Design an enzyme around this catalytic site. Structure first.
Site, PDB file in Angstrom:
ATOM      1  N   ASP A   1      14.799  -2.378  13.002  1.00 32.76           N
ATOM      2  CA  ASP A   1      15.689  -1.549  12.191  1.00 32.76           C
ATOM      3  C   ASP A   1      15.206  -0.104  12.230  1.00 32.76           C
ATOM      4  O   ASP A   1      15.039   0.555  11.195  1.00 32.76           O
ATOM      5  CB  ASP A   1      15.725  -2.067  10.748  1.00 32.76           C
ATOM      6  CG  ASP A   1      16.948  -1.518   9.955  1.00 32.76           C
ATOM      7  OD1 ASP A   1      17.933  -1.111  10.598  1.00 32.76           O
ATOM      8  OD2 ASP A   1      16.899  -1.539   8.710  1.00 32.76           O
TER       9      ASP A   1
ATOM     10  N   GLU B   1       0.838  -1.188   0.000  1.00 31.29           N
ATOM     11  CA  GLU B   1       0.000   0.000   0.000  1.00 31.29           C
ATOM     12  C   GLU B   1       0.878   1.243   0.000  1.00 31.29           C
ATOM     13  O   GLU B   1       1.876   1.315   0.719  1.00 31.29           O
ATOM     14  CB  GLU B   1      -0.897  -0.025   1.244  1.00 31.29           C
ATOM     15  CG  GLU B   1      -1.307   1.334   1.803  1.00 31.29           C
ATOM     16  CD  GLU B   1      -1.782   1.250   3.251  1.00 31.29           C
ATOM     17  OE1 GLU B   1      -1.122   0.555   4.056  1.00 31.29           O
ATOM     18  OE2 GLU B   1      -2.796   1.891   3.593  1.00 31.29           O
TER      19      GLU B   1
HETATM   20  N1  LIG Z   1       4.593   1.984   1.390  1.00 35.03           N
HETATM   21  C1  LIG Z   1       5.141   3.141   0.974  1.00 35.03           C
HETATM   22  N2  LIG Z   1       4.404   4.160   0.453  1.00 35.03           N
HETATM   23  C2  LIG Z   1       5.015   5.278   0.037  1.00 35.03           C
HETATM   24  N3  LIG Z   1       6.345   5.476   0.091  1.00 35.03           N
HETATM   25  C3  LIG Z   1       7.182   4.540   0.541  1.00 35.03           C
HETATM   26  C4  LIG Z   1       6.606   3.290   1.042  1.00 35.03           C
HETATM   27  N4  LIG Z   1       7.622   2.526   1.453  1.00 35.03           N
HETATM   28  C5  LIG Z   1       8.750   3.240   1.267  1.00 35.03           C
HETATM   29  N5  LIG Z   1       8.490   4.443   0.716  1.00 35.03           N
HETATM   30  C6  LIG Z   1       9.507   5.456   0.357  1.00 35.03           C
HETATM   31  O1  LIG Z   1      10.749   4.785   0.120  1.00 35.03           O
HETATM   32  C7  LIG Z   1      11.746   5.224   1.034  1.00 35.03           C
HETATM   33  C8  LIG Z   1      12.599   4.030   1.440  1.00 35.03           C
HETATM   34  O2  LIG Z   1      11.773   2.908   1.784  1.00 35.03           O
HETATM   35  P1  LIG Z   1      12.444   1.580   2.423  1.00 35.03           P
HETATM   36  O3  LIG Z   1      11.314   0.600   2.637  1.00 35.03           O
HETATM   37  O4  LIG Z   1      13.259   2.020   3.624  1.00 35.03           O
HETATM   38  O5  LIG Z   1      13.397   1.049   1.209  1.00 35.03           O
HETATM   39  P2  LIG Z   1      14.959   0.551   1.268  1.00 35.03           P
HETATM   40  O6  LIG Z   1      14.878  -0.946   1.551  1.00 35.03           O
HETATM   41  O7  LIG Z   1      15.524   0.844  -0.101  1.00 35.03           O
HETATM   42  O8  LIG Z   1      15.634   1.369   2.353  1.00 35.03           O
HETATM   43  C9  LIG Z   1      10.962   5.835   2.185  1.00 35.03           C
HETATM   44  O9  LIG Z   1      11.711   6.812   2.919  1.00 35.03           O
HETATM   45  C10 LIG Z   1       9.707   6.393   1.526  1.00 35.03           C
HETATM   46  O10 LIG Z   1       9.796   7.763   1.054  1.00 35.03           O
HETATM   47  O1  LIG Z   2      20.609   1.072   5.762  1.00 33.41           O
HETATM   48  C1  LIG Z   2      20.471   1.117   6.996  1.00 33.41           C
HETATM   49  C2  LIG Z   2      21.096   2.229   7.924  1.00 33.41           C
HETATM   50  N1  LIG Z   2      22.310   3.006   7.465  1.00 33.41           N
HETATM   51  C3  LIG Z   2      22.209   3.570   6.116  1.00 33.41           C
HETATM   52  C4  LIG Z   2      23.455   4.401   5.741  1.00 33.41           C
HETATM   53  O2  LIG Z   2      24.178   4.879   6.901  1.00 33.41           O
HETATM   54  C5  LIG Z   2      23.325   5.303   7.959  1.00 33.41           C
HETATM   55  C6  LIG Z   2      22.443   4.135   8.424  1.00 33.41           C
HETATM   56  C7  LIG Z   2      19.535   0.087   7.718  1.00 33.41           C
HETATM   57  O3  LIG Z   2      18.392  -0.314   6.901  1.00 33.41           O
HETATM   58  C8  LIG Z   2      20.236  -1.201   8.278  1.00 33.41           C
HETATM   59  O4  LIG Z   2      20.452  -1.016   9.693  1.00 33.41           O
HETATM   60  C9  LIG Z   2      21.557  -1.675   7.570  1.00 33.41           C
HETATM   61  O5  LIG Z   2      22.522  -0.619   7.485  1.00 33.41           O
HETATM   62  C10 LIG Z   2      21.338  -2.289   6.178  1.00 33.41           C
HETATM   63  O6  LIG Z   2      20.920  -1.312   5.209  1.00 33.41           O
END
Ligand SMILES: Nc1ncnc2c1ncn2[C@@H]1O[C@H](COP(=O)(O)OP(=O)(O)O)[C@@H](O)[C@H]1O
Ligand SMILES: O=C(CN1CCOCC1)[C@@H](O)[C@H](O)[C@H](O)CO
Ligand SMILES: Nc1ncnc2c1ncn2[C@@H]1O[C@H](COP(=O)(O)OP(=O)(O)O)[C@@H](O)[C@H]1O
Ligand SMILES: O=C(CN1CCOCC1)[C@@H](O)[C@H](O)[C@H](O)CO
Ligand SMILES: [Mg+2]
EC number: 2.7.1.171
Lengths: 289, 287
Positions: free
Chosen positions: B195, B86
């Protein structure tokens, strides 16, 4: 492709990609007395160098008059480190209907250096431009495979050695270095001004036509531009069709494509970590097969 | 601040934000709503996304914190997988920080307080911290679980890939000291996001949102280590949290142990940039 799979798996007629903003820097739009602006923020110490390279890249593309990119306005030092880069704000949607037009424009951009008012006969650039946050050497070189092996592939693999001490990457690179000249099929490579980072996330369109941004420009082999476009997808087929109507694939295109994608995987390994070790090594092994 | 700096450098009276990733995927507008799609092209992608789905489902089941609803995991031709969820309109966590502190404390209290009680540390399936699969084998004892299935796993990868002598010797000395940090305290399994750094939390007009979990049942304090070590959370988040779960005796030294895990994970993910903090945290723990 991926869109087709999503339409089928999710059961949707329409599917339009959309959308702090970016993987390297934070970006926000502001309304000001003189108009809207777009501002990128990076808190790292090398931020100013990165943005000055983006400014130089934007200026070189704008000078061609062949593509639309934001006008760079100002690079600002931030208290406590890093910098902000203000540029012209552009109303933008994801690239769709304007893909074939962008293909035409990118081919004209690459062909521009062969127009009589362009004289650049070496590969490289007049200033440092950053691949993401990694500074690149743009020292002029007469020979493209030398420039690319030394100032792109070797630079990335030296960082991989420093930070990951990866034995397999070292051993595969030594064998690949020997193969690189054969991949060029005896061709004469001519310099082409490149956007340098033409991922689908860095192109868009409005009602007038396509728009590209976030360049990391240099004079390179025209083919290098397409590798990142191809490996992460997002460009309609009509983009490539229009492009290759103007610049047909030279012999050995498919194998050079692997070499250019390898660079992008190495750069993603350095930026984003071990997730990208497997495609890096895998691409090298495929080249060595 | 930066807004004042922009107003001054651009010489504008007004500066009104408008228009409102991380190497994941893209958002798409769909007939049935907006969706967000994460793509991972590696062979382990499905297993990774299944762990994320399981983590999101466990958090969703508490009803205490807002997370994106998982929709589908799709195998990709030419390797890897796509994870559709979503779409949530999301801004950085600020005004809802105190609310999020309250919700995360309730989340950590949910297991002991609810009627169905998970009585060991671990999880029913593998969840990945970033790109590394974790073993979540159930263990009665938290220092055992953490030393074996978190710290030792990371240090074995560092031995394999870096053969780091200092990490090896510091671990030999640190391992014996770990029980001292936990003696005389009751530890109850607590469901963790796993995390919770500032880049994995956000908010909308209704309240805070958390995402990208790597969940398991652990010591509640472990949740906060990555939040503190990389910054980005307003003080009011921690104030609200610790009003409900005050810092138990020995909190600061356990905080070092938990931050150590995260430094080691960053060393395995991103390389030797994180060797210095890893070793240094170990040295602080041995002083
Ligand atoms: N369900 C969602 N709906 C809208 N935006 C999302 C959603 N999930 C992630 N995002 C966007 O993607 C960014 C990174 O999501 P994340 O799940 O942490 O991906 P990654 O595994 O690459 O770190 C978020 O900061 C947000 O802006
Ligand atoms: O990426 C993560 C956190 N670091 C991103 C770059 O530097 C600041 C913190 C986390 O999602 C996780 O703890 C691990 O690093 C694997 O990605
Ligand atoms: N000049 C601009 N005007 C308006 N929006 C922009 C502009 N430049 C970029 N954007 C938006 O910001 C997003 C990320 O910008 P980008 O320059 O690629 O940042 P990064 O270098 O951090 O990846 C784009 O997807 C686009 O939506
Ligand atoms: O970040 C970029 C593109 N990748 C981001 C995350 O995974 C999908 C594509 C580009 O800007 C560039 O190729 C390089 O990362 C330098 O930043
Ligand atoms: Mg994340």
């Amino acid at each position: 492709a991926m869109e087709q799979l999503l339409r089928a798996e999710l059961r949707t007629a329409t599917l339009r990609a959309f959308g702090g903003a970016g993987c390297i820097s934070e970006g926000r739009a502001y309304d000001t007395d003189a108009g809207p602006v777009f501002v990128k923020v990076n808190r790292r110490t090398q931020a100013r160098q990165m943005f000055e390279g983006e400014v130089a890249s934007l200026e070189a593309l704008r000078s061609t008059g062949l593509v639309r990119v934001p006008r760079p306005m100002k690079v600002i030092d931030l208290p406590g480190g890093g910098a902000a880069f203000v540029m012209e704000h552009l109303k933008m949607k994801s690239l769709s209907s304007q893909a074939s037009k962008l293909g035409e424009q990118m081919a004209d951009l690459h062909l521009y250096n062969q127009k009589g008012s362009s004289y650049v006969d070496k590969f490289g650039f007049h200033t440092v431009t950053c691949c993401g946050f990694i500074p690149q050497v743009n020292e002029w070189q007469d020979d493209w495979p030398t420039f690319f092996a030394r100032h792109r592939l070797q630079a990335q693999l030296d960082l991989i050695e420093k930070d990951y001490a990866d034995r397999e990457a070292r051993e595969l690179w030594s064998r690949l270095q020997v193969k690189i000249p054969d991949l060029f099929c005896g061709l004469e490579i001519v310099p082409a001004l490149l956007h340098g980072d033409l991922w689908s996330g860095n192109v868009a369109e409005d009602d007038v036509g396509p728009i590209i941004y976030d360049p990391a420009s240099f004079y390179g082999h025209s083919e290098f531009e397409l590798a990142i476009a191809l490996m992460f997808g997002g460009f309609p087929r009509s983009f490539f069709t229009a492009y290759h109507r103007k610049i047909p694939k030279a012999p050995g295109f498919d194998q050079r494509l692997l070499l250019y994608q390898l660079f992008n995987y190495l750069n993603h390994w350095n930026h984003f970590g071990r997730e990208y070790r497997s495609p890096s090594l895998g691409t090298m092994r495929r080249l060595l097969k």
